[PDB]
């Protein structure tokens, strides 16, 4: 009926107070266009959507998205050129994501213009946007240049090139930033003669601008331009601009070159890399700002293996290793951890002998670093050098560092290494332990600071949780049982504490046979505090069923049952039975 004319339906859906019910109306605009057909979609729907709509961000974004898909619903590509006016309105609005969704939709329906009508209606749109009063139109136009250039006549290719040149010399920094970003995207559709003629001058002009925001985005496009030029003329044009960009007084630009450095290297090949690009890497690692240093440090391994193999090793040793030697003792806890993440991969690149002579002092230095990220990032990449050096040659060279910061004066340091002991035992392996470590874990148990002893009993628990009840029974359990029964009565208590936490991982048979007889022998000891914790200890074991021997536990438990001892024993016997 008259109230079902899809235009009237859309109208009465648009007078809603709620925005979610207008959003869900515009999100299903496909249905309105499909119900109107293709004759009335052009006759009345697109005129409606072009001028009339003034609503919030959320709605206009969906409208741009919908106009992006209306090609079939409008009559096919012979009539696609009428989706342009409303998307043009949307390409100038104040909210930025709506502008960019409209530009994305315009580039999408660009491919649907046949060159004949592409020249006719789609290019005058890009012109109008590039010449608009307020700059939002001009940023949108910057988005629209790359898509339509290639399939258009040569004269209008020249005209578009001129309009883009005009946009790069714009007054407002916002337009200049936009064009600087789209510079590479435009260069990809230009003929090589025009890339040298027109693109490289605009490139050098933007990279030598007053604002840093644009210089930043022109050195970004530098990697696309360098990939479009042959290595020979590449040196003359691109390298002045690049070298002055690496020495720019704004750390943002130097950060951008450090970031896109592993890509710039592959772009300019391995010759110019060896010549001018490696020293720029060196003074970027010696940069005055820390956040540039970290970005450069992340790019060391990606840079080293991507070198000319003949000169790669000589240059790595002479030119890059001293800078690491000083970067390991940097001041910022982020540069250090960033280089710690990737410095391990330099080991298959240098060989076993060179790694031992020149890389092992650096990894051992960054192992003793106080920052937890540096230590963890070093340990996380230990297989990288484990396969290059060998488990023996590796364990034998870090053991001194483990024992160094194991007997370090600061209790914080000793706790820091007890923390990382089990994951550093994940890559050292079941073997290549024992030696003087096990001894380190026991010396941990006799420590003065209580936090160290607590973390070390809870460390033995996880350290048999990774090797096995068999391993624990073979090497740890004897050292533990040996401590029960000794002059300093506190060590007996710590023996029983670790026995308590140890029974939580071994099956009944191994826990029973060897932990009960010496817990009861050391339980016969005169001191009341040792027996007191004996009772508390047999309480927590209990739970590991012992049933047949549980009773044999209840009878000596009654025998022991000085007031504190009795409290603990009675509470244990009540809870167990």
């Amino acid at each position: 009926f008259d109230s079902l004319y899809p235009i009237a339906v859309l109208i009465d859906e648009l007078r809603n107070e709620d925005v979610q019910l207008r959003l869900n109306s515009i999100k299903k605009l496909s249905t309105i266009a499909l119900a109107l057909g293709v004759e009335r979609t052009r006759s009345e729907l697109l005129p409606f959507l072009t001028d009339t709509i003034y609503d919030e961000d959320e709605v206009l974004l969906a409208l741009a998205e919908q106009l992006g898909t209306f090609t079939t619903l409008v009559g096919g590509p012979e009539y696609v050129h009428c989706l342009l006016p409303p998307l043009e309105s949307l390409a100038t609005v104040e909210e930025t994501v709506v502008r960019d969704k409209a530009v994305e939709s315009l580039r999408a329906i660009s491919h649907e213009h046949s060159p004949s009508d592409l020249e006719a209606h789609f290019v005058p749109l890009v012109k109008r946007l590039a010449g608009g009063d307020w700059f939002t139109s001009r940023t949108s136009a910057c988005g629209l240049f790359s898509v339509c250039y290639p399939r258009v006549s040569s004269a209008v290719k020249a005209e578009l090139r001129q309009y883009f040149r005009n946009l790069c010399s714009d007054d407002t920094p916002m337009v200049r930033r936009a064009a600087a970003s789209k510079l590479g995207e435009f260069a990809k559709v230009l003929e090589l003669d025009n890339v040298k003629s027109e693109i490289i001058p605009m490139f050098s002009n933007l990279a030598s601008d007053e604002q840093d925001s644009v210089r930043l985005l022109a050195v970004e496009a530098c990697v696309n331009i360098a990939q479009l030029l042959p290595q020979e003329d590449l040196e003359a044009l691109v390298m002045p601009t690049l070298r002055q960009a690496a020495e720019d007084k704004s750390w943002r630009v130097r950060y951008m070159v450090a970031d896109k450095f592993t890509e710039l290297q592959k772009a300019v090949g391995p010759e110019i890399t060896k010549t001018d690009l490696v020293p720029a890497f060196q003074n970027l690692m010696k940069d005055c700002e820390a956040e540039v240093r970290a970005a450069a440090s992340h790019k060391v391994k990606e840079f080293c293996e991507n070198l000319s193999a003949d000169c790669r090793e000589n240059v790595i040793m002479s030119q890059i290793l001293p800078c690491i030697k000083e970067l390991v003792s940097d001041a910022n806890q982020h540069v250090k951890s960033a280089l710690a993440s990737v410095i391990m991969g330099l080991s298959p690149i240098l060989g076993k002998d060179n790694t031992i002579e020149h890389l092992l002092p650096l990894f051992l230095a960054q192992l003793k670093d106080e920052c937890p990220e540096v230590r963890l990032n070093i340990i996380s990449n230990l297989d990288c050098v484990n396969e290059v050096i060998g488990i023996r040659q590796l364990s034998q060279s870090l053991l001194p560092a483990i024992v160094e910061l194991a007997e370090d004066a600061k209790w914080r340091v000793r706790l820091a290494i007890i923390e990382y002991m089990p994951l550093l035992a994940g890559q050292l392996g079941v073997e290549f332990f024992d030696e003087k470590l096990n001894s380190l874990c026991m010396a941990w148990l006799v420590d003065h600071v209580y936090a160290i002893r607590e973390a070390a009993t809870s460390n033995l628990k996880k350290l048999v949780e990774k090797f096995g009840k068999e391993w624990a029974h073979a090497t740890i359990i004897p050292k533990v049982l040996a401590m029960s029964g000794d002059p300093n009565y506190l060590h007996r208590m710590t023996t029983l504490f670790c026995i308590n936490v140890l029974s939580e991982v071994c099956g009944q048979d191994i826990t029973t046979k060897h932990m009960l007889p010496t817990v009861l022998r050391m339980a016969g000891d005169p001191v009341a505090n040792v027996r007191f914790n004996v009772a508390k200890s047999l309480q927590k074991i209990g739970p590991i069923l012992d049933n047949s021997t549980l009773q044999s536990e209840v009878k000596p438990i009654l025998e022991k049952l000085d007031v504190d001892v009795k409290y603990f024993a009675q509470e244990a016997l009540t809870v167990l039975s």
Binding site: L4, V9, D18, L21, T31, A35
Partner: protein
């Protein structure tokens, strides 16, 4: 207290659900209209 703080939470829940409820209801209102709109359009296309 402890029993009156929970009642305010419950009231807040019922308030939120009520707001959402209305929207969903009069969203279905539009949806049925759209089916009607399509029905009519199909009815015309056969002629």
């Amino acid at each position: 207290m402890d029993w009156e703080v929970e009642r305010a939470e419950l009231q807040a829940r019922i308030a939120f659900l009520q707001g959402e409820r209305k929207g969903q209801e009069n969203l279905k209102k539009d949806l049925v209209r759209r089916i009607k709109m399509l029905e009519y359009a199909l009815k015309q296309e056969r002629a």
